[PDB]
């Protein structure tokens, strides 16, 4: 035979390499007198409708733990948080000697000195600060703010909101995002019906140390995710399949009044504190909770050698690395989650689990990486309905086994919602042989 | 090319060659009616890489059009494979994996063929 087949260029051939870029965020039409941190001063463009294309008979390899979509969005979320903060206020005059002892949650009663809007006339200020934004520096005790070693705290500038609206990540021209769309998908290895899309599903940029909130649901399985299950240090993500309810309230009137500290600097703070004065709680129905934790330990037995699973509590210590960070109305709860994670399975109610929550104003929300924030209390009784959806479990190093609930890195919080995706580069100029003689 | 700034979309990647060329054409048909520093930076380099790949279609006489046939002897050292062998038993990504050790040489040879073709009609 001869078969003198020749060259042919194709523009538009479907060809991809597992490459990388910077993505751009893209919300829905909501965004104008709204200045929340996440999707206002960062990404104008709104996507009205999806164009997702299925891919037939292809098997694409996914590896979320060496993904840098999530590390790139983590960097955009830190830089986004900060370029939404620095034009706010900057309360440099609170690092003083603080005259604090309680008066009728026993947070404390604290007066100190300030400066008023005039510099020579001076200001004495009343306040109510919490036990954990305070350190004992050495009745009528004398304390300090927790963040006067490191960087100066700013205020939230309350016209800023913090509602975690769905941020999409749409890829620029050139690149496509390959969603998995496989059920019981582990986040590692192949994927069967990987379909291409131009932007992700709307992820909510929530922050929560101990367990995940408002997540997307897996449908059929509950999914155990880690980088290295033999390595006890790596944080195990547990993704549910049913939306566990939680209601977090502070059932307490606490009014917000302001001081003139600078020109245009009006520090908002607590005032009178009445209502149902006890620690802010979160309630969890024991039926769904112990059912989903039973199915969680069923699947963890399916991973961990079919062993005897105990759920110890946390290791204690610093209540931000250790406890349950929470993102209610401009206020930040740390809920001692101890009676949620305490079992040994190899016998609780169908009633209600109630967990206390020490709340916090001045947050170093991300552990050194980023900047601080004063969170002003809003006006009083606050109810935020939430769907607890994830768990973050770290097995320990000791015929038993343990899932001590600790967090880990912060980008972990989004790896439950970016397992399915993969930024991919298109090289569209393919050179295939056929029989032409033209051009 | 199918994007906000215009660049091809992966129409039916898992489809084998004989259907995928048809869907490349239907890609075209639907694609053109379907048509803070991070966004600007990304789409500027999208412009740059687009004008790059249209200059590759420019310097092969293909003028920025699909299915542009040119006159090169496709060497059996680049591939000894028969037509229907690859064009009914394969998809496009694994064939680009096959010949990724030749693409610079193919761009080389198509450029000598295009300058040779225009210099010969420059004579004639």
């Amino acid at each position, epitope marked *: 035979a001869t078969n003198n087949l020749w060259v042919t260029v194709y523009y538009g051939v479907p060809v991809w390499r597992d490459a990388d870029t910077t993505l751009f965020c893209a919300s829905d039409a909501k965004a104008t007198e709204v200045h929340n941190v996440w999707a206002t001063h960062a990404c104008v463009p709104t996507d009205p409708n999806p164009q997702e294309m299925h891919l037939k008979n292809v098997t694409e390899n996914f590896n979320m733990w060496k993904n840098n979509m999530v590390e790139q969005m983590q960097e955009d979320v830190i830089s986004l948080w900060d370029q939404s903060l620095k034009p706010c206020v900057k309360l440099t005059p609170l690092c003083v000697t603080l005259n604090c002892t309680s008066a009728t949650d026993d947070v404390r009663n604290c007066s100190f000195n300030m400066t008023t809007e005039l510099r020579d006339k001076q200001q004495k200020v009343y306040a109510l600060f919490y036990k954990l934004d305070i350190v004992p520096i050495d009745n009528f005790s004398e304390y300090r703010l927790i963040n006067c070693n490191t960087s100066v705290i700013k205020q939230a500038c309350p016209k800023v909101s913090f509602d975690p609206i769905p941020i999409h990540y749409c890829t620029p021209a050139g690149y496509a995002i390959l969603r998995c769309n496989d059920k019981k998908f582990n986040g590692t290895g192949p994927c069967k019906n990987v379909s291409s899309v131009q932007c992700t599903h709307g992820i909510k940029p929530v922050v929560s140390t101990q367990l995940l909130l408002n997540g997307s649901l897996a449908e059929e399985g509950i999914i155990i995710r880690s980088e290295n299950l*033999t390595n006890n240090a790596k944080t195990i993500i547990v993704h549910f399949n049913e939306s566990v309810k939680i209601n977090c309230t502070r059932p307490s009137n606490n009014t917000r009044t302001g001081i003139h500290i600078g020109p245009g600097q009006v520090f908002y703070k607590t005032g009178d504190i009445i209502g149902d004065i006890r620690k802010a709680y979160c309630n969890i129905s024991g039926a769904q909770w112990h059912k989903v934790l039973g199915r969680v330990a069923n699947k963890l037995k399916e991973h*961990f*050698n079919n062993k005897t699973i105990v759920f110890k509590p946390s290791s204690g210590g610093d209540p931000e690395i250790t406890m349950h960070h929470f993102n209610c109305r401009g206020e930040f709860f740390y809920c001692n989650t101890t009676k949620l994670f305490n079992s040994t399975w190899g016998t609780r109610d169908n009633g209600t689990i109630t967990i206390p929550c020490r709340i916090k104003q001045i947050i170093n929300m991300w552990q050194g990486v980023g900047q601080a924030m004063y969170a002003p209390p809003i006006k009083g009784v606050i109810k935020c309905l939430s769907n607890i959806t994830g768990i973050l479990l770290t097995r320990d190093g000791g015929n038993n086994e343990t899932f001590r609930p600790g967090g880990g890195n912060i980008k972990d919080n989004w790896r439950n919602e970016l397992y399915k995706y993969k930024v991919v580069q298109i090289e569209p100029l393919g050179i295939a042989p056929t029989k032409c003689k033209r051009r | 090319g199918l994007g906000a700034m215009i660049f091809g979309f992966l129409g039916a990647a898992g489809s084998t060659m004989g259907a995928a060329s048809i869907t490349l054409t239907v890609q075209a048909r639907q694609l053109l009616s379907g048509i803070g520093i991070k966004q600007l930076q990304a789409r500027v380099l999208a412009v740059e890489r687009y004008l790059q790949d249209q200059k590759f279609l420019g310097l092969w006489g293909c003028s920025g059009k699909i299915i542009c046939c040119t006159a090169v002897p496709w060497n059996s050292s680049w591939s000894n494979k028969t037509f229907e062998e690859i064009w009914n038993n394969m998809t496009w990504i694994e064939w680009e994996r096959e010949i990724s050790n030749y693409t610079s040489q193919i761009y080389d040879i198509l450029t000598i063929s295009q300058t040779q073709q225009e210099k010969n009609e420059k004579d004639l």
Partner: antibody
Amino acid sequence: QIHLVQSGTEVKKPGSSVTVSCKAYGVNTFGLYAVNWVRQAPGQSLEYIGQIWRWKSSASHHFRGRVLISAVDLTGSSPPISSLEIKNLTSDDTAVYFCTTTSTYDRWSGLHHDGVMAFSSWGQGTLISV
Amino acid sequence: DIQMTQSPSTLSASTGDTVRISCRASQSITGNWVAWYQQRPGKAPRLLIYRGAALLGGVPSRFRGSAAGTDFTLTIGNLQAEDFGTFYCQQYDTYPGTFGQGTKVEVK
């Protein structure tokens, strides 16, 4: 980095069955990595046997229906471990056996091609005499 | 359906030298899909060449693979003493992957 070990050196009876482990200290899974089972007769060159590759167990036509391979990936106490098992060890099966993982994530690296692949990181080879 | 051969079959040299092995297949694979190995006898193989001329991160820079059609080459310039042993060639295009018959490298 990646490292491989397996079972020791086992000498058995003709007409027995043998199993050889494969502990992959470094494989993040065997979903995306793939492992390969390769014999080597004494002095004679190495001969391929089988593989696992995205959980499709395969062996050669020289070994179909007699030899069976398994793999369980990363659990807690265990690294990802595969295992080669042979019934009816003839005198021909007197050989040195090998398990090797290959990275099959970045598809254009060229260590792999559509099921067959270049074998990245070897173990220690196991003598089996009959 | 491949029974590969390579040239040579047994070769010796010394340190600081330059040396050549090629392997030839019955077919003519196009996409450079070859891989070459070495071992000292009693140890395991070490992948040094995948896909013609791509080296690993850890294989020394002195090795060089090369491609010509069916005959694919590896050259060692400035040979070091801990490089002796048996080499092996590999096609990995049509399943199953059949290998080379080995080449011992020693000192005369």
